[PDB]
Design a protein around this nucleic acid. Structure first.
Ligand SMILES: [K+]
Ligand SMILES: [K+]
Ligand SMILES: [K+]
Ligand SMILES: [K+]
Ligand SMILES: [K+]
Ligand SMILES: [K+]
Ligand SMILES: [K+]
Ligand SMILES: [K+]
Ligand SMILES: [K+]
Ligand SMILES: [K+]
Ligand SMILES: [Mg+2]
Ligand SMILES: [Mg+2]
Ligand SMILES: [Mg+2]
Ligand SMILES: [Mg+2]
Ligand SMILES: [Mg+2]
Ligand SMILES: [Mg+2]
Ligand SMILES: [Mg+2]
Ligand SMILES: [Mg+2]
Ligand SMILES: [Mg+2]
Ligand SMILES: [Mg+2]
Ligand SMILES: [Mg+2]
Ligand SMILES: [Mg+2]
Ligand SMILES: [Mg+2]
Ligand SMILES: [Mg+2]
Ligand SMILES: [Mg+2]
Ligand SMILES: [Mg+2]
Ligand SMILES: [Mg+2]
Ligand SMILES: [Mg+2]
Ligand SMILES: [Mg+2]
Ligand SMILES: [Mg+2]
Ligand SMILES: [Mg+2]
Ligand SMILES: [Mg+2]
Ligand SMILES: [Zn+2]
Ligand SMILES: [Zn+2]
Lengths: 211, 102, 55, 91, 69, 51
RNA sequence: GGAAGGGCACCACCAGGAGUGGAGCCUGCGGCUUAAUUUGACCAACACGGGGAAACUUACCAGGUCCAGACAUAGUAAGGAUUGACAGACUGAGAGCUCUUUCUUGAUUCUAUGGGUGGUGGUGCAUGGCCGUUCUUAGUUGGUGGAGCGAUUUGUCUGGUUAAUUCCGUUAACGAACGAGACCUCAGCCUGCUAACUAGCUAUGCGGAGGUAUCCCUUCGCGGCCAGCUUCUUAGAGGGACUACGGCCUUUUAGGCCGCGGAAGUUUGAGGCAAUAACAGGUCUGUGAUGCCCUUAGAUGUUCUGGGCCGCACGCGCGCUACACUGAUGUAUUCAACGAGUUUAUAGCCUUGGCCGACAGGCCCGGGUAAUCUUUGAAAUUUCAUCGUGAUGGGGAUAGAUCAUUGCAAUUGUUGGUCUUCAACGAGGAAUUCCUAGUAAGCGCGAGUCAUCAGCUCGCGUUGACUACGUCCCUGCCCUUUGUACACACCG
């Protein structure tokens, strides 16, 4: 019975809180993102991850636990909110997944340069028009420094950034401090819209071949 | 068995809201029902202006954050069952549909 | 402490009765529309909440 | 922490029957929303369970999230004297 | 930091070797006599005694006090 | 006064009364010390010694 | 670079407007004082930390509580490890905090050793993220070729042009990738489209008032979901400007000036977004972000009481109010926009209407979770009188008495009323800020903070200008040439 303004703001706040909770809980399991769909007397939450076996667990025990805790914490009516785990298509095109993969590689003792180059190569071989990986923090010395790896196309200004660029930021807790990892992936135009924006770049003009 | 059924649609995305309104209107028309609207209420623009810096240093720069809420009103002259059937059509996420009488 | 003394000071209003729902800090709380988030946390989560920068 | 026997029994019963439990980080809250016990005792009992690996703890947006483990399930079954057939609702 | 007054010591309950033993008296025939009153409160119930203070009787469970003159 | 005094001011006035009663005749009452800086002085407290 | 050439900028100047700097007061900073008057920051700190602190916030000071010290081992221990508590004293205190008196409870604890936990504790010169600045300017970098032993260089340029490394061209370079532009949001035009009882107009029917009072004219009020419609309002789709057209100048170019028409001819106006490389710039006091160090029970943890952060010989910054008649006061008069609003409990948020009251305020019916109700919604201004050059009916600092509202609490006045008091100030030195059109300035309004407090910030509208449309003189920026004994880079 609350006003529309407060209703929409609460919906956004719930989405943000659920995203943060899932990110904290499903860190190692991989968590690309979540989507909330509202239906009459039913709300659907879809978890996107690169490893849905871990998210579901054995016989869906983990997903059932997550559904129960979400329902109890968010005051949802019982048997009204259900969770689903879905594969992420082209995980190499998801900035969050690549950032988590780089975090896992770095936490495993892999050299920063090798891990970043591998991530760049995997992203490029996955159909990305371009990518950029930045590693910041105390590397090899007590003095912090930044490492930048880049290949392919990249835009940084104007409206098309919000659709043609997928970016993520993650922190890695190392022994001597925090490491900052930024992943920025430039998508490619997709007429279907499944793998990229369904809109061409503003300054791209195509002339049909004459008969 | 005829009543003025009021349908209120609210969404943050203009395209989805307009498509849902068009679908509802076409569904009502296909049943030879009388449709009034959709009426577009003035857009609600929630605005928050917060300082960019997480501290007090530097030139005081501000971020203007807006959240736009679009509301539509549709009136149908028919029974409850037919409007309930019409509204059963698939609705995309982000669009809230409320059905009432008068 | 004693029940009548420990945490007995009223907290029905003022900055001490409100905290950020994200970080729990009591400073720079945005109470508009019921966000109840501190300005830093809100600026961090604005895109997820649904607030867009047009100008 | 000193906890009355009835309160511990209620907390353990709820945890085993549900298999999950949350708590807002409010030490002075009179009663837990889902359990009649004060919030502080629920939080501290769950911390004790976590310390010895009976439960998994997640924290986010000033809230706790506790998930029972196999060792926790065994401990709760032994301590509550429930039949082996009965299991948490999650499974 | 510097302190002026002596450090305070938290209260510790005194130890009674057998406090219950002195609440009952057993005769040769086997009859049991209680040397202290029992709280009339239903919640306390039977078996709950009240202290014999030098001006009143005090119950340790419900805190009920009876003053005798 | 219309809003009603709490327990602490009532206790303070009772303590002041007790101190006045125990004062030997022709002598000032003992010291009554309190943290109540917001207490309002009423005529009954005239002659009291307060810290 | 107190070297040359070209170009550019109201954080530069010119020509000007408003000013600031002078007065009172508000608010931040230093100093002083203090138990404490917590602390970060010194163009790019100083109404900044959204930092308008009565309690909390709070980090400071004087005191009193509590463990919210997991887990492991050992000790003690049901012949009881240990909790709580009446009364009296103690205490600022209905804190069993502690002591006296002794009841209750039952392995949940207590003691010791490890290990934890918390900390607005130090370190922003260990860090992440974010933000500011270099830097609002047009700049930045590969590949393959060319030159050089090499660091490097050409590409990225003589010239013209552009707001633009924007283009035309020239060309040992050719092709590219970022920035710019494109982009997206708001505003400006549509009597053309869709649709409106949560927006209106038109005519009609009835009714009130006035006018010759029937019929006619003017003005108001009420209904028509089968009266019509969308000009006015709302918001979706589209259209619209491209310098399109004409005259001149320019390399038959890129382009520029003027001009009709047009809503619009500065990129139509204003914004958002915004490269490479950097700063030991700010933030550990936003974060359950974080390394290391410190502390961790007589605590730097947490809570309660009280005080302080506001303390006043003094200096500075952003501001508000003025110095008056282009005015003050008292009437009459009537034109906005952006927005915000409830747990319904007797009732909580915005509040209409009625009653009470001089005001401040109070009481009673109610509407609104909202284009439905507040909202029938400002001031400057317009209009007519009084005042009459007098620190004066300018000005409103300071202070007295007293009355209400918020709050658990108003004293060091929280704020708001009534009467009374009536300070400096008569236009402000050296210096110094912002600004080129619906702009400056004046005027008010909404939101943030908010139980109560706006002289602040973020937005909104109303009235509405002068001057210029130029330059490199000052302060700076970009490119080229040139000198260097600089490279921590001329604060060398
Ligand atoms: K001045
Ligand atoms: K400032
Ligand atoms: K930093
Ligand atoms: K080359
Ligand atoms: K730290
Ligand atoms: K904060
Ligand atoms: K110059
Ligand atoms: K230039
Ligand atoms: K020379
Ligand atoms: K040189
Ligand atoms: Mg671009
Ligand atoms: Mg741009
Ligand atoms: Mg200047
Ligand atoms: Mg000048
Ligand atoms: Mg001045
Ligand atoms: Mg000070
Ligand atoms: Mg500058
Ligand atoms: Mg305090
Ligand atoms: Mg304080
Ligand atoms: Mg502390
Ligand atoms: Mg720094
Ligand atoms: Mg070469
Ligand atoms: Mg070069
Ligand atoms: Mg129209
Ligand atoms: Mg520094
Ligand atoms: Mg201060
Ligand atoms: Mg300022
Ligand atoms: Mg009006
Ligand atoms: Mg005067
Ligand atoms: Mg006057
Ligand atoms: Mg104040
Ligand atoms: Mg302020
Ligand atoms: Zn926060
Ligand atoms: Zn009893």
């Amino acid at each position: 019975q609350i006003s529309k303004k407060r209703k929409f703001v609460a919906d956004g706040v719930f989405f943000a809180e659920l995203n943060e909770v899932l990110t904290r809980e499903l860190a190692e399991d991989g968590y690309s993102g979540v989507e909330v769909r509202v239906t009459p007397v039913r709300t659907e939450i879809i978890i996107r991850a690169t490893r849905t076996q871990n998210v579901l667990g054995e016989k869906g025990r983990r997903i059932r636990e997550l559904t129960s805790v979400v329902q109890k914490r968010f005051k949802f009516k019982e048997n009204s909110v259900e969770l689903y785990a879905e594969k992420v298509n082209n995980r190499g095109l998801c900035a969050v997944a690549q950032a988590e993969s780089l975090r896992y590689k770095l936490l495993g003792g892999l050299a920063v340069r090798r891990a970043c180059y591998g991530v760049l190569r995997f992203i490029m071989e996955s159909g990305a028009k371009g990518c950029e990986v930045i590693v910041s923090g105390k590397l090899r010395a007590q003095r912090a420094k930044s490492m930048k790896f880049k290949d392919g196309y990249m835009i940084s200004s104007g409206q098309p950034v919000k659709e043609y660029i997928d970016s993520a930021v993650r922190h890695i807790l190392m022994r001597q401090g925090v490491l900052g990892i930024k992943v920025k992936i430039m998508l490619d135009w997709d007429p279907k819209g499944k793998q990229g924006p369904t809109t061409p770049l503003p300054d791209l003009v195509t002339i049909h071949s004459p008969k | 068995q005829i009543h003025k059924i009021r349908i209120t649609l609210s969404s943050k995305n203009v395209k989805n809201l307009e498509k849902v309104c068009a679908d509802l209107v076409r569904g009502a028309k296909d049943k030879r029902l009388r449709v009034k609207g959709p009426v577009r209420m003035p857009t609600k623009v929630l605005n928050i202006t917060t300082r960019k810096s997480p501290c007090g240093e530097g030139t005081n720069t501000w971020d203007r954050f807006e959240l736009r809420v679009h509301k539509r009103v549709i009136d149908l002259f028919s029974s409850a069952d037919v409007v309930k059937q019409i509204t059963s059509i698939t609705i995309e996420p982000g669009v809230e549909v409320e059905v009432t009488i008068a | 402490g004693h029940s009548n003394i420990w945490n007995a000071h009223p907290k029905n209003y003022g900055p001490g009765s409100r905290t950020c729902r994200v970080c729990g800090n009591p400073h720079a709380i945005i109470r508009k529309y019921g966000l109840m988030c501190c300005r830093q946390c809100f600026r961090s989560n604005a895109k997820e909440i649904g607030f867009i920068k047009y100008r | 922490m000193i906890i009355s026997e009835k309160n511990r029994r209620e907390i353990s019963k709820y945890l085993f029957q549900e298999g999950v439990c949350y708590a807002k980080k409010d030490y002075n809250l009179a009663k837990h929303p889902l359990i009649d016990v004060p919030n502080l005792q629920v939080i501290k009992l769950m911390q004790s369970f976590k310390s010895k690996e009976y439960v998994r703890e997640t924290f986010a947006w000033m809230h706790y999230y506790w998930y029972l483990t196999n060792d926790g399930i065994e401990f709760l079954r032994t301590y509550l004297n429930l039949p082996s057939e009965i299991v948490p609702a999650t499974l | 930091k510097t302190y002026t007054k002596p450090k305070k010591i938290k209260h510790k309950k005194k130890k009674v070797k057998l406090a219950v033993l002195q609440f009952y008296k057993v005769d040769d025939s086997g009859k049991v006599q209680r040397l202290r009153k029992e709280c009339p409160n239903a919640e306390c119930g039977a078996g709950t005694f009240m202290a014999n203070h030098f001006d009143r009787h005090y119950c340790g469970k419900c805190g009920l006090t009876y003053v005798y003159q | 006064f219309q809003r009603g005094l709490k327990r602490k001011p009532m206790a303070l006035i009772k303590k002041l009364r007790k101190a006045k009663r125990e004062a030997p005749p022709g002598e000032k009452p003992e010291v009554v010390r309190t943290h109540l800086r917001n207490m309002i002085i009423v005529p009954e407290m005239i002659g009291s010694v307060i810290g």
